[PDB]
């Protein structure tokens, strides 16, 4: 049959076929390796996407800027199904200590419920206490790897003065979480936390910006969300604006498909190699037509049909590019796994690039390549006249 | 007994403006067990006649009745079936596929016939026995001599028990001594009742066949039937 | 050089095969030279901006300095003009919208025409902004649009520069601003240095710049200015070749990924040259019977793979100049004011490579060709 | 004068092909070598053509000792002195008649302009008219071997080595090509040819027969 003739021919010129495959190996493994990382990076964001669905962000929409009282938010949070609440400031900070520096850390402004609500685990020293709010204290917590970068050790970091934005802060604790460990990808040098009333007093900013409610049963959010917003406006007084639910996904997806774009640009450049590989497999297939012009003619004298020859030379190029984009898919999957068992000094997050969608897409492409670049030759061969060939 | 039956056969090879005529009113019939030899100068289109009969060429006008049924006009897919079952091609240079051994080079027509692998090797063996091959069947044509390669080529021509063997100057790539060995083989094969129609530019070789035909300018110009 | 004629006869023997073999190298050299050339333009552009950083002598030595001295020292023969500035990188809000870490310059009276900030909307700093202690601000064009959609839109509205209310009195642009994008500057707002010292408790004067527009004068003059501005109260370019280093690194990493397609293109020729050798073993024997040596056949089959890649490289280079020009036009949005193109070193680097690709890959079949036995060939 | 002088030529591979070969051949001769299969029929020829070096013994070509010379040297000697003719013609497919004939002259160091003159003179010597620029695609078998024979003559060799010249040709056209060789032998070129057919050997002056690595007959005695 036509599959066996395909395999016989490939085995006939082993080192020619082998060399051709290597062009497809190289190209597929390059594309899959690049596509792996960009996916794994993407999926480690889509974890955070779904952690954020437990949160309900409320904000002041001017149309259906008054000072928001904190005890409104506590009262709203009474609402059944709401497990906790918190309010925060934010700002940038350049964070100098002694001769060290991290010039883009995101300084967060908690409100006594914040630390507990977001479940941050204290590893050295203490969390924010009630005294720190009533004394207007410039106290600071650092995340595990900010403390390591700035003070060699979370233990060593405790009770050191760190200049924040030319403002002296005393380090009370070091914390860590899942989110802090993996938050280098969002482009942050650190996630230090202090009281919102310190942020609000040192830097000019007012003391509430984001208002959040945690609702651990996520199926309630379509109803509880707008209810918490309504309840906010019933308590805030009709100041002619109305509180609304902030959509979480429109800022996550704004960074999700910026990683995707830039994966595609580098994945394309790697793809140029697979495309060159493709022109290579077409070309060698064409030499195997002229190499076998007499053979085809003889085959047709013996009873080969145009159709037989056409699918034989198709199958022959497909066997090259599939077996190629599989040896390649594997060697990619390898390098990707050892690229992950390496990115551990940066990220605490699953990066193996197994992704069934990219694996299957590699084979899908690998097929198309053989099919596309293999028809012109297979056509040429099928059309060859027995009389002219003999 | 009646196999080949050409009739009013023309073949004109169009080439831009040149409607160049080659075969013209070829009338001819050939019966089973015959050994015809076709002779003539270059340009006469023994080539074109032969392919016409072997179903590698379709005639411009006229008729060709293989075993009574008309076969000039059949679709390629169906015509290629008829070719596989009815025509055994023997070539001057032997046209052995160099990556296949003698055995599987002889098996090749059986694949297109659609024969099981069990049978194919044994059909091949029996027919390599029929042509008298001593050097082992598991050798490439690389390591075969002339007469041995032409034996394999004739075994391959015989495997699907065809009606006609078309031979085109079989001794043409061979020395007198081993050519005469192959010519006896063809005589012995035709003696068993297998029809043969051979082209040659050699009086010495046409002499082995039961019937002489000559072509001049695409017209059968002397037979031995009368 | 019959080997060159032999090479071209062979190339021309199978035109559409030699073509498809060249297309690997074109596709390879094109994409490599395009990445290398943009990365080179980004580096060369940065390198032009360093030769602006030598027409600006900066003197640094704190104690509280005073503009009176800089004004005095600017009468010196080479010194074209002077200015003095005030710094912070604070954050510009405007009602939910928010630009991060813009470089807020606080200039003196002379700062506007010494640096030459061309205003596109409204007005630049007038003197009654210094005198009356006004909190007013100029925004750069790309900071203007990012914060307020249009340029004219931003005008006469309130910004929150680190909290303090600043009235946008104008919006400016220059080449040096349009490229501030590449140095990671969020924006370049300018203001009155009186109102930077008031609103942030920084010193009124912090940088002291002496504009000298004779390049072949900054030695001898510049050291004198540093030791004149020391008579009252008893040096070289910054980390400019650091972005130069960082770009060059990113150029490499990407250009190498493009370079794989040249490596596959290279295994392309080796595969085609290997069939060439087998499929004319009979020629090789024939040639050797006519008096071709082992060495002749060797340097013939090598010259053929070199010509084949070298041509592809030379074509690929050309096609990577058209490509690296409309790339110039594509980057009149993003970066802009840039001279983008393929430098003479980059151009012949590619020729050296493409030549070398042909050699590396092509010696292996050229060897097999050379050691062919004439007897077995014939 | 004397051209070929083989003396005590052994060739072995463990298989022994040639065994005390002693043959002399003078200018103008036309020697036809016949013999049974694997007698060293071709190994002798490739020894005379310098494509094979003997395991021992000596070969003087136009008086020059050539057995055991270097590869670079033995190619030049081959080029100047030998004119191989082949059964199958062995013309390069992409070069036309003139260019095919010009090729041995390229491996000598001759002017590109002068090659053209010499090639045309030798296409004339072999009666090939107005097919100067035909590819082998466009030539008959007689025409092809005519071109191939012109290629053997262009460098004024001492020896024309011919290996069954009319094997690919029909009996009519062989006789024509065989007459061509005879005429070239008449003008004074030495031909050592090999053949399986007595109808072809007939044309030669002398008649050698090799059996198992050693000459058995010789019509010159
Ligand atoms: Mg004919
Ligand atoms: Mg022999």
The Cα B174–Cα B149 span in angstroms is 11
What count of CB pairs under 8 Å joins B to D?
A: 16
Spell out a b/e string for C146-162, using b for 16 or more CB atoms within 10 Å of the CB, else e: bbbeebeebbeeebbbb
Q: How far is CA A95 from CA A170, A183, C203, D59, in A?
A: 12, 17, 21, 93
Q: How far is CA C61 from CA B198, C212, C227, C228, C229, in A?
A: 109, 20, 10, 12, 9
Ligand with minimal distance to D41 CA: 2
The count of domains in chain B is: 1
The Cα C247–Cα C243 span in angstroms is 6
Shortest Cα distance, chain C CAs vs residue D145, angstroms: 15
CB within 8 A of C150, min separation 6: which ones? Answer: C144
Shortest Cα distance, chain A CAs vs residue C97, angstroms: 13
What is the token pair recorded at D29?
């001769």
Would strands C164-173 and C136-140 be described as parallel, antiparallel, or unpaired?
parallel
Angle between helices A306-340 and A2-12 (to 10 degrees): 60
Query: Who among A65, A203, A276 is closest to C261 (CB)?
Result: A276
Query: Computed over its alpha carbons, how large is the radius of gyration of chain D?
Result: 17
How far, rounded to the nearest angstrom, does the alpha carbon of residue A214 sit from its chain's CA centroid? 25
Beta partners for B66? B69
D-chain residues near C13 (CB < 8 A): 94
| DSSP sequence for D37-102 | TTSSHHHHHHHHTTSS--SEEEEEETTEE-TT--HHHHHHHHHHHEEEE-TT----TTS-HHHHHH
- Residue C291 gets which letter from DSSP? T
The Cα C192–Cα C129 span in angstroms is 7
Which of C56, C47, C119, C121 minimizes the C-alpha distance to C82?
A: C56
Entry resolution in angstroms? 3.3
Query: Who among D82, D84, D92 is closest to C283 (CB)?
Result: D92
* Contact present, C303 and C361 (Cβ < 8 Å): no
Owner of token pair 């013209």: B24
The Cα A357–Cα A373 span in angstroms is 24
C and B: touch, per 3+ CB pairs < 8 A?
no
Q: Describe the strand order of the beta sheet including B164-168 as a list of residue ranges.
A: B87-90, B164-168, B195-199, B35-39, B211-216, B219-222
CB atoms within 10 A of CB C375: 15
Ligand with minimal distance to B218 CA: 1
**Interface contact C295-D103, CB threshold 8 A:** no
Shortest Cα distance, chain C CAs vs residue A111, angstroms: 22
Dihedrals φ, ψ of D46, to 5°? -65, -25
CA torsion sign for B116, B122, B128, B133 is positive
Dihedrals φ, ψ of D15, to 5°? -115, 135
Beta partners for A53? none
Which of C324, C308, C319, C322 minimizes the C-alpha distance to C27?
A: C319
CB within 8 A of B8, min separation 6: which ones? Answer: B25, B26, B27, B61, B62, B63
Owner of token pair 């067990």: B33
Q: How far is CA D59 from CA D2, D44, D55, D206, D221, in A?
A: 12, 11, 12, 20, 20
The Cα C199–Cα C168 span in angstroms is 16
CA dihedral A336, A337, A343, A348 (to 10 degrees): 130
The Cα C28–Cα C112 span in angstroms is 49
A-chain residues near B199 (CB < 8 A): none
Beta partners for C192? C107
| DSSP sequence for B35-103 | EEEEE--TTS-HHHHHHHHHTSS--SEEEEEETTEE-TT--HHHHHHHHHHHEEEE-SS----TTS-HH
Interface probe for A, chosen from C32, C187, C257 (most Cβ of A below 10 Å), is: C257
Q: How far is CA A276 from CA C82, D48, D95, in A?
A: 58, 50, 32
Beta partners for B19? B14
What is the token pair recorded at C178?
């349009």
Q: How far is CA D179 from CA A116, D182, D187, D194, in A?
A: 112, 5, 13, 16
Ligand-binding site membership of B221 (annotated): no
CA dihedral A86, A92, A97, A102 (to 10 degrees): 110
* Contact present, B81 and B109 (Cβ < 8 Å): no
Spell out a b/e string for B154-167, using b for 16 or more CB atoms within 10 Å of the CB, else e: bbbbbbbebbbbbb
Residue of D nearest to B203 (CA): D171
* Contact present, C209 and C52 (Cβ < 8 Å): no
Which of A386, D132, A277 minimizes the C-alpha distance to B80?
A: A386
Which of A211, A207, A191, A209 minimizes the C-alpha distance to A199?
A: A207
The Cα D103–Cα D92 span in angstroms is 10
Beta partners for D215? D210
- Residue C135 gets which letter from DSSP? -
Hey, is B26 helix, strand or coil? strand
Which of C32, C17, C18 minimizes the C-alpha distance to C308?
A: C18
Which of D123, D135, D138 minimizes the C-alpha distance to D93?
A: D135
Domain that holds residue D177: 1-221
CB atoms within 10 A of CB C266: 25
Residues constituting chain A: 390
What is the token pair recorded at D10?
């052994």
Residues of C at the D interface (Cβ-Cβ below 8 Å)? Answer: 2, 9, 12-13, 282-283, 286-296, 374-375, 378
* Contact present, A130 and A112 (Cβ < 8 Å): yes
Which of C111, C88, C84, C109 minimizes the C-alpha distance to C163?
A: C88
The Cα B150–Cα B157 span in angstroms is 10
Owner of token pair 């034989």: A312
Q: Furthest-apart CA pair in chain B: how many Å? A: 54
* Contact present, C180 and C140 (Cβ < 8 Å): yes
Dihedrals φ, ψ of A330, to 5°? -65, -65
Q: How would you class B106 by CB atoms within 10 Å of its CB: exposed for 0-12, middle for 13-18, buried for 19 or more?
A: buried
CB within 8 A of C368, min separation 6: which ones? Answer: C274, C277
Q: Answer left, alpha or beta for residue B16, where phi above 0 means left and psi between -120 and 50 means alpha.
A: left
Owner of token pair 């013996």: A302
Ligand with minimal distance to D164 CA: 2
The Cα B162–Cα B86 span in angstroms is 4
Which of A112, A91, A95 minimizes the C-alpha distance to A146?
A: A95
CB within 8 A of C229, min separation 6: which ones? Answer: C59, C61, C65, C69, C70, C73, C208
Write out the H or E segment, with its range, that includes residue D34: strand D30-34
Q: What angle do CA A287, B48, B84 make, to 5 degrees?
A: 65
Query: Who among D46, D90, D104 is closest to C291 (CB)?
Result: D104
Query: Who among A12, A303, A390 is closest to B113 (CB)?
Result: A303
Residue of D nearest to C371 (CA): D71
**Interface contact D196-B177, CB threshold 8 A:** yes
Q: Is D171 on the interface with B (CB under 8 A)?
A: yes
The Cα C298–Cα D81 span in angstroms is 24
Q: Is B108 on the interface with A (CB under 8 A)?
A: yes
Owner of token pair 């070199």: C306
The Cα B121–Cα B117 span in angstroms is 7
Beta partners for D60? D5, D65
Shortest Cα distance, chain A CAs vs residue B106, angstroms: 11
Query: Who among D71, D78, D106 is closest to C289 (CB)?
Result: D78
* Contact present, B50 and B197 (Cβ < 8 Å): yes
CA torsion sign for D19, D24, D25, D27 is positive
CB atoms within 10 A of CB C5: 12
CB within 8 A of A153, min separation 6: which ones? Answer: A147
CATH of the domain at D198: 3.40.50.300
Residues constituting chain C: 378
Q: Per DSSP, which regions of C61-213 are E strands?
A: 81-88, 92-94, 97-99, 104-107, 118-122, 136-140, 158-161, 164-173, 190-192, 207-211
Interface probe for B, chosen from D171, D194, D195 (most Cβ of B below 10 Å), is: D171
What count of CB pairs under 8 Å joins A to C?
A: 97
- Residue C125 gets which letter from DSSP? -
SS (H, E, C) D149-208: HHHHHCCCCCEEEEECCCCCCCHHHHHHHHHHHHHHHHHCCEEEEECCCHHHHCCCCEEE
Owner of token pair 């904000």: A59
The Cα A309–Cα A301 span in angstroms is 13
**Interface contact B176-D170, CB threshold 8 A:** no
* Contact present, B52 and B27 (Cβ < 8 Å): no
The Cα A244–Cα D2 span in angstroms is 115
What is the token pair recorded at D192?
């050592």
Q: How would you class A250 by CB atoms within 10 Å of its CB: exposed for 0-12, middle for 13-18, buried for 19 or more?
A: exposed
CA dihedral A235, A236, A238, A239 (to 10 degrees): 180
Q: Answer left, alpha or beta for residue C376, where phi above 0 means left and psi between -120 and 50 means alpha.
A: alpha
The Cα A87–Cα A112 span in angstroms is 9
Residue of D nearest to B93 (CA): D168
CB within 8 A of A381, min separation 6: which ones? Answer: A289, A292, A296, A309, A310, A312, A313
A and B: touch, per 3+ CB pairs < 8 A?
yes
CB within 8 A of A207, min separation 6: which ones? Answer: A87, A89, A109, A196, A197, A199, A200
Residue of B nearest to D170 (CA): B201
The Cα B210–Cα B208 span in angstroms is 7
* Contact present, C101 and C88 (Cβ < 8 Å): no
The Cα C94–Cα C154 span in angstroms is 10
* Contact present, C248 and C39 (Cβ < 8 Å): yes
The Cα C259–Cα C248 span in angstroms is 16
Domain spans of chain C?
A: 2-48+242-377, 56-236
The Cα C313–Cα C310 span in angstroms is 5
Spell out a b/e string for C292-327, using b for 16 or more CB atoms within 10 Å of the CB, else e: bbeebbbebbbbbbbbbbbbbbbbbbbebbeebeeb
The Cα B116–Cα B97 span in angstroms is 21
Touching C (3+ Cβ pairs <8 A), the chains are A, D
The Cα D213–Cα A205 span in angstroms is 109
Q: What angle do CA C96, C100, C104 make, to 5 degrees?
A: 115
Shortest Cα distance, chain D CAs vs residue C33, angstroms: 36
What is the token pair recorded at B47?
């080539």
Euclidean distance between the first and the last CA atom of chain B, given in angstroms as a whole number: 19
Query: Who among D46, D72, D106 is closest to C293 (CB)?
Result: D72
Owner of token pair 């010009």: D102
A and C: touch, per 3+ CB pairs < 8 A?
yes
Shortest Cα distance, chain A CAs vs residue B180, angstroms: 25
CB within 8 A of D186, min separation 6: which ones? Answer: none
What is the token pair recorded at B118?
């069990």
The Cα D187–Cα D160 span in angstroms is 13
* Contact present, B53 and B3 (Cβ < 8 Å): no
Contacts 24+ apart (CB under 8 A), D102-111: D102/D154, D103/C287, D103/C290, D103/D151, D104/C290, D104/C291, D104/D79, D104/D151, D104/D154, D104/D155, D105/D154, D105/D155, D106/C2, D107/C287, D107/C290, D107/C291, D107/C292, D107/C296, D107/D75, D107/D79, D108/C291, D108/D79, D108/D80, D108/D155
Beta partners for D9? D21
SS (H, E, C) chain A: CHHHHHHHHHHHCHHHHHHHHHHHHHHHHHHHHHHHHHHHHHHHHHHHHHHHHHEEEEEECCCCCCCCCHHHHHHHCCCCCCCEEEEEEEEEECCEECCEECCCEEEEEECCHHHHHCCCEEEEECCCCHHHHHCCCCEEEEEHHHHHHHHCCHHHHCCCEEECCCCEEEEEEEEECHHHHHCCCCCCCCCCEEEHHHHHHHCCCCCCCEEEEECCCHHHHHHHHHHHHHHHHHHHCCCCCCEEECCCHHHHHHHHHHHHHHHHHHHHHHHHHHHHHHHHHHHHHHHHHHHCHHHHHHHHHHCCCHHHHHHHHHHHHHHHHHHHHHHHHHHHHHHHHHHHCCCCCCCCCCCCCCCHHHHHHHHHHHHHHHHHHHHHHHHHHHCCCHHHHC
């Amino acid at each position: 049959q036509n599959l066996k003739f395909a395999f016989s021919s490939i085995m006939a010129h082993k080192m020619r076929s082998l060399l051709t495959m290597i062009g497809i190996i190289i190209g597929v493994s390059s594309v899959v390796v690049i596509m792996a990382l960009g996916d794994s990076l993407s999926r480690q964001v889509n974890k955070d996407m779904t952690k954020s669905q437990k949160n309900i962000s409320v904000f002041f929409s001017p149309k259906k800027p008054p000072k928001p009282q904190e005890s409104w938010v506590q009262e709203a949070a009474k609402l059944k199904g709401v497990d906790s609440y918190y309010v925060t400031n934010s700002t940038n900070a350049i964070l100098t200590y002694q001769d060290k520096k991290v010039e883009n850390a995101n300084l967060t402004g908690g409100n006594r419920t914040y630390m507990d609500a977001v479940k941050n685990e204290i590893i050295a020293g203490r969390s924010l206490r009630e005294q720190d709010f009533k004394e207007f204290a410039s106290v600071i917590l650092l995340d595990e790897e900010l403390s390591i970068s700035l003070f060699e050790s979370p233990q060593e970091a405790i009770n050191k003065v760190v200049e924040v934005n030319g403002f002296s802060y005393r380090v009370i604790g070091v914390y860590t979480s899942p989110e802090a460990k993996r938050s280098k990808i969002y482009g942050f040098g650190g996630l230090p936390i202090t009281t919102n009333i310190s942020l609000a007093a040192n830097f000019n900013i007012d003391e509430i910006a984001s208002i959040v409610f945690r609702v651990n049963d996520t199926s309630l959010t379509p109803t509880l969300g707008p209810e918490l917003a309504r309840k906010m406006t019933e308590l805030a007084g009709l100041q002619q604006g109305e509180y609304q639910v902030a959509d979480e996904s429109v800022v996550f997806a704004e960074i999700q498909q910026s990683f995707s774009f830039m994966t595609t640009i580098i994945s394309s450049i790697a793809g140029i190699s697979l495309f060159v590989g493709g022109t290579g497999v077409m070309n060698i297939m064409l030499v195997s037509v002229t190499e076998r012009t007499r053979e085809i003619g003889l085959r047709k004298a013996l009873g080969a049909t145009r159709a037989n020859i056409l699918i034989q030379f198709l199958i022959e190029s497909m066997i090259l590019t599939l077996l190629g984009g599989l040896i390649g898919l594997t060697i990619a999957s390898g390098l990707t796994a050892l690229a992950g068992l390496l990115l551990q000094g940066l990220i605490e997050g699953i990066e193996v690039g197994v992704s069934i969608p990219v694996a299957l897409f590699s084979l899908a492409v690998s097929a198309s390549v053989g099919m596309i670049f293999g028809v012109l030759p297979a056509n040429k061969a099928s059309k060859l006249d027995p009389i002219e060939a003999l | 007994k009646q196999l080949i039956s050409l009739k009013n056969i023309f073949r004109s090879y169009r080439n831009g403006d040149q409607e160049l005529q080659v075969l013209k009113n070829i009338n001819l019939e050939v019966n089973e067990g015959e050994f015809v030899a076709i002779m003539g100068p270059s340009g006469s289109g023994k080539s074109t006649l032969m392919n016409t009969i072997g179903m590698l060429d379709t005639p411009t006008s006229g008729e060709y009745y293989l075993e009574g049924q008309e076969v000039a006009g059949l679709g390629e897919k169906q015509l290629a079936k008829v070719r596989n079952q009815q025509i055994g091609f023997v070539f001057q240079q032997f046209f052995l596929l160099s990556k296949l051994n003698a055995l599987q080079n002889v098996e090749l027509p059986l694949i297109y016939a659609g024969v099981s692998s069990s049978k194919r090797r044994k059909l091949a063996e029996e027919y390599l026995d029929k042509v008298e091959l001593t050097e082992r069947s598991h050798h490439l044509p690389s390591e075969l001599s002339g007469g041995q390669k032409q034996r394999v080529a004739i075994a391959r021509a015989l495997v699907n028990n065809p009606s006609i063997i078309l031979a085109d100057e079989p001794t043409g790539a061979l020395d007198t001594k081993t050519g005469n060995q192959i010519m006896q083989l063809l005589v012995d094969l035709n003696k068993e009742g297998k029809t043969i129609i051979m082209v040659t530019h050699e009086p010495e070789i046409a002499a082995y066949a039961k019937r002489q035909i000559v072509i001049r300018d695409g017209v059968i110009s002397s037979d031995s039937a009368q």
